Amino acid sequence: ELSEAERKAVQAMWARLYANSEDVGVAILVRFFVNFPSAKQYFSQFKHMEDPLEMERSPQLRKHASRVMGALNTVVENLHDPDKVSSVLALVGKAHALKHKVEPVYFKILSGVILEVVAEEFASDFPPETQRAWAKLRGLIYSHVTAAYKEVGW
């Protein structure tokens, strides 16, 4: 699915991102929760937060951002090993289906926010090939997470 060069474009850009994983990741989630306030129903500590300035300072928000960034780091760094990606994404899917009861579509929506922010951040380094690489990564995340929701009885 993801070629050699496409793998390499994602990984090179991800390294640039992860050098401020903590600022990037919360910026993403703040944006996500601002533009899709429904998604915040699942988080006890900020379900009623509206202020972005407060959302950015919330430890539970920040924890989720660090955890999402950690999981995707595992996926991005191991794109060459398809079964480490399957297992990471299956743990995540199942957890979200069963522990957290999160509608799968919020994965789609979050991913779209991720892509918006990566495009903004690397606007001067986002040629078609690189857009394609990220699009396939996004699509692969959604398959495995969807497949996991089915496997568990959603």
Residues in touch with ligand HEM (CB under 6 A): 39, 42-43, 60, 64, 67-68, 71-72, 92, 95-96, 99-100, 102, 106-107, 110
Q: Which does 92 bind (CB under 5 to 8 A by kind): ligand XE, ligand HEM, none?
A: ligand HEM
Q: Which does 28 bind (CB under 5 to 8 A by kind): ligand XE, ligand HEM, none?
A: ligand XE
Structural tokens at position 91? 């743990």
d(C-alpha 79, C-alpha 10), whole Å: 10
Q: How far is the CB of 30 from ligand HEM (least distance, A)?
A: 13
Which of 52, 129 has the CB closer to ligand HEM?
52
Q: How far is the CB of 124 from ligand HEM (least distance, A)?
A: 26
Q: In Å, what is the CA distance from 24 to each residue of 45, 52, 101, 141?
A: 21, 15, 26, 19
d(C-alpha 58, C-alpha 34), whole Å: 14
Q: How far is the CB of 66 from ligand XE (least distance, A)?
A: 9
Tokens 């918006």 identify what position? 116
